[PDB]
Amino acid sequence: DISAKDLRNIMYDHLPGFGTAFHQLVQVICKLGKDSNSLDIIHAEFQASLAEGDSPQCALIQITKRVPIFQDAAPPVIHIRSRGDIPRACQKSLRPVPPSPAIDAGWVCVFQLQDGKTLGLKI
């Protein structure tokens, strides 16, 4: 059976750059997938999108829309010390956290800083 680590690495293989919002989304998708025993469908959806000619970025967003565990799912909250701990390639995708953020609306995660600040990661 495909593991969360296996799948993260497979997805990362197709992504350009390093520590982009799409890299964070891969983490988020694999963790929620793991916890709902859905890694298989997620992998199958990812592969199928690639096979139809979609970009890996599109394939990842399609997962959030087509795999039912992401339906109106709130972004996970990732605790960090400061804004500088968030990778460089994500910094410009950080926003004030909206009302009702959802992963299937492009809110990948919410970072919560030691000092209580919070930032949503938007695609």
Q: Is 23 in the site for Cl ion (CB under 5 A)?
A: no
Q: Which is nearer to Cl ion, 28 or 97 (CB)?
A: 28
Helix, strand, coil shares of the chain, percent, nearest 5, are 55, 15, 35
Q: Which is nearer to Cl ion, 8 or 122 (CB)?
A: 8
Q: Which two tokens stand for residue 88?
A: 């460089």
Q: Is 43 in the site for Cl ion (CB under 5 A)?
A: no
Exposed/middle/buried for residue 86 (C-beta within 10 Å: 0-12, 13-18, 19+): buried
Q: Is 8 in the site for Cl ion (CB under 5 A)?
A: yes
CA distance between the termini of the chain: 30
Stretch that binds Cl ion, among 6-14, 78-86, 90-98, 101-109 (CB under 5 A): 6-14
Positions in the binding site for Cl ion (CB under 5 A): 8
